[PDB]
């Protein structure tokens, strides 16, 4: 199917507690594969998936060099952001960046991404054309002008269409037994009386990969979107994910409710009901 690679960078200032901390993680789809933390005893880019371990010393040295340099650049960016927002040197602030590439089912670039945020709010984003920018405010317009003058978009386009896709395809091949394996959800419905005339039906999905899933409840074949409690999909810790959806229903009406599960690991969507056996 389709696949993606993404790097997520967080840089956080902390006046009075040293220089800003820089953390980077890299993912393929929903699988983390590298990390870097400037606060580590010995900061290095480190493997976090088995299929990246085979990369040689030139890989780990080069990624470590790049992440150390990125950490230094973010310390300057945090200082610049204070000037752009008229802010004092006393507060703690965060810059985040996410970038990478999406591949279609044919292995070709579907689209590229590079976006940044300041204090949790959109700051600037590379447009889908990989040639122009969208700035969120007048400060980010200063950055936009600087990056237009330095042809930053062209540099990003060359990475996103070249190395990003080439290395993603390499990771997908080296990690094919996991990255290219969907694990379908294990599903069941539980029933919990709330009172003598209502009960909760809870539709469970467990053990699935990747994380994208749809769970919906229908009553008499109609979606109960506004009456369903849906928890955020959550990691089990073994690479897989979990999710549930719940509805409160009138006692005696349970069989009018069906749970519908869609997931890439399923040949066809599943329909489940409470089975009072």
């Amino acid at each position: 199917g389709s696949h993606s690679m993404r790097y997520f960078y967080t840089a956080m200032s902390r006046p009075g507690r040293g220089e800003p901390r820089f953390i980077a993680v890299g993912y393929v789809d929903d699988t983390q594969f590298v990390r870097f933390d400037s606060d580590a005893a010995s900061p290095r880019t480190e493997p976090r998936a088995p299929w990246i371990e085979q990369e040689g010393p030139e890989y780990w040295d080069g990624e470590t060099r790049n992440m150390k340099a990125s950490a230094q650049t973010y310390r300057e960016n945090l200082r610049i952001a204070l000037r752009y927002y008229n802010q004092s040197e006393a507060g703690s602030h965060i810059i985040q960046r996410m970038y990478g590439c999406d591949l279609g089912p044919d292995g070709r670039l579907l689209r590229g991404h590079d976006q940044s945020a300041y204090d949790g709010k959109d700051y600037i984003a590379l447009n889908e054309d990989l040639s122009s920018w969208t700035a969120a405010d007048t400060a980010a317009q200063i950055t936009q002008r600087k990056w237009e003058a330095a042809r930053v978009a062209e540099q990003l386009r060359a990475y996103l269409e070249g190395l990003c896709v080439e290395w993603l395809r390499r990771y997908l091949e080296n990690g094919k037994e996991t990255l290219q394996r969907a694990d379908p959800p294990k599903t069941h419905v539980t029933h919990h009386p709330v009172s003598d005339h209502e009960a909760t039906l809870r539709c469970w999905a467990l053990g699935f990969y990747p994380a994208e899933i749809t769970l919906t409840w229908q009553r008499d074949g109609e979606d109960q979107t506004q009456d369903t409690e849906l928890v955020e999909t959550r990691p089990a810790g073994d690479r897989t994910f979990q999710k549930w959806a719940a509805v409160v229903v009138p006692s005696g009406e349970e069989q009018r409710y069906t749970c519908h599960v869609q997931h890439e690991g399923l040949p066809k969507p599943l329909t489940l009901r409470w089975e009072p056996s």
């Binding site: 960078y9 340099a69 752009y84 940044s116 600087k146």
Partner: peptide, 8 residues
């Protein structure tokens, strides 16, 4: 593989 950072 990662890419480079830019000064804002």
């Amino acid at each position: 593989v990662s890419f480079i950072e830019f000064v804002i």
